[PDB]
């Protein structure tokens, strides 16, 4: 089972959030319970709401009173709505599925999140440029709004003596960050390396090759 | 709220190492006998991984270094052996009293031999001074352990304010750490200068490493 979590991306302040938590077809959710929990940049985990097969709410007294989740079974699909947005509400969303132990729940089954941030500016898409070649060689993914940007190399075939490393904020207020791979130098002049870099709240997806 | 505190807040252990952590709630998770505490696992990145439920039960399929203990307020989750896919941070729950709550969480760094770094230096490429600024990237790689100073110099003249570092993760398979450090320059100011260099001090290294190129 694989619970895929959608709508995150930019929120305006005083705005609503719609969030939805697809789950694998084939799965029967009746003896579950579905819940959202979050974690802000840094922080530990809140969890905010649930909902159980008859249509039962519950939501953590933090956030009651703006909040509400739902469910359209016929799309094995879970929805969380939150409104007058601020600050405190920029995390990771998770959706989570619960499981019993003599009644109570624990959360045994988690999607992999989606950011949600609260702000007034733009999206802006990365300019992608390359750090050209043990040899070390990468991608520098510069200058994008929000978070986040994913890379992978050869098309994830790549994997060993990859490091990507955290974004740093720039004092333009957007985001860069760089993707190094250390390879052996003999294979230079015969492998071909290409940097994926995805940024989807611009709708950018970059194959860039790094030659030397 | 049933508030759950976590102790320590970060350790550092070698591989082969016996980790415990602790949770403390401020009132008893107990009901009817059993106790309503779970432990997640937590690597950077991911979501969260269920490893215990119900104080003591392992999740089937988690990894049998993996145990749980405690009653009432007080519990513990215990790491046999750490492995160094263990770097994470952990995290009790209790599933006692609405709204289910979390501790803080207890990060596991693990400890090994210091590394110095290996270093390399990059200069902007064309691409980037075609649309009007220049990024110096100076790379320190596989080190150990995370503390690092990197000192940029510009035609020999050191610099600050004008850089950025960033750090990964600890690596889960050999412990260490990788470094970025970028200068950021105009491309006008970039090209008034010939020759850029970085300066590395590390607890590995007896004297500081520099690299350097000659712009062009």
């Known amino acids: 089972v694989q619970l895929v979590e959608s709508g995150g991306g930019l929120v305006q302040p005083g705005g609503s959030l719609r969030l939805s938590c697809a789950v694998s077809?084939?799965?029967?959710?009746?003896?579950?319970?579905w819940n959202w929990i979050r974690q802000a940049p840094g922080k530990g985990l809140e969890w905010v709401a649930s909902i159980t097969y008859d249509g039962s709410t519950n939501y953590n007294p933090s956030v009651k009173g703006r909040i509400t989740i739902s469910r359209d079974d016929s799309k094995n699909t879970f929805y969380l709505q939150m409104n007058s947005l601020r600050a405190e509400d920029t995390a990771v969303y998770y959706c989570a599925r619960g499981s019993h132990y003599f009644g109570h729940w624990h959360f045994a089954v988690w999607g992999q999140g989606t950011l949600v941030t609260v702000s007034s500016a733009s999206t802006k898409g990365p300019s992608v440029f390359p750090l050209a070649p043990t040899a070390a060689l990468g991608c520098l993914v510069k200058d994008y709004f929000p978070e986040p940007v994913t890379v992978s190399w050869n098309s994830g075939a790549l994997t060993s003596g990859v490091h990507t490393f955290p974004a740093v904020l720039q004092s333009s207020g957007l985001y860069s960050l760089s993707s190094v791979v250390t390879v052996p130098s003999s294979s230079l002049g015969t492998q071909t390396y290409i940097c994926n870099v995805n940024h989807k709240p611009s709708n950018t997806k970059v194959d860039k090759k790094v030659e030397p | 709220d049933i508030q759950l505190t976590q102790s320590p807040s970060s350790l550092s252990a070698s591989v082969g190492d016996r980790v415990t952590i602790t949770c403390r709630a401020s009132?008893?998770?107990?009901?009817?006998?059993?106790?309503?505490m779970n432990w997640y696992q937590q690597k950077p990145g991911k979501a969260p991984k269920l490893l215990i439920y119900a104080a003591s039960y392992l999740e089937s399929g988690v990894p049998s270094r993996f145990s749980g203990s405690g009653s009432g307020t007080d519990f513990t989750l215990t790491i046999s052996r750490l492995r160094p896919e263990d770097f994470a941070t952990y995290y009790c729950?209790?599933?006692?009293?609405?709204?289910?709550?979390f501790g803080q969480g207890t990060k596991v760094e693990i400890k090994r031999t210091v590394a110095a770094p290996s270093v390399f230096i990059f200069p902007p490429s064309d691409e980037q001074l075609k649309s009007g600024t220049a990024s110096v990237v100076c790379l320190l790689n596989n080190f150990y352990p995370r503390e690092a100073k990197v000192q940029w110099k510009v035609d020999n003249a050191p610099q600050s304010g004008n850089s950025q570092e960033s750090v990964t993760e600890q690596d889960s398979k050999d412990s260490t750490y990788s470094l970025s450090s970028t200068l950021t320059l105009s491309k006008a100011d970039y090209e008034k200068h010939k020759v850029y260099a970085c300066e590395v001090t590390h607890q590995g290294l007896s004297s500081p490493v520099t690299k350097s190129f000659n712009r062009g």
């Open positions: 077809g084939y799965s029967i959710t009746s003896g579950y319970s």
């Open positions: 009132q008893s998770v107990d009901y009817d006998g059993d106790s309503y």
């Open positions: 729950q209790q599933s006692h009293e609405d709204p289910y709550t």
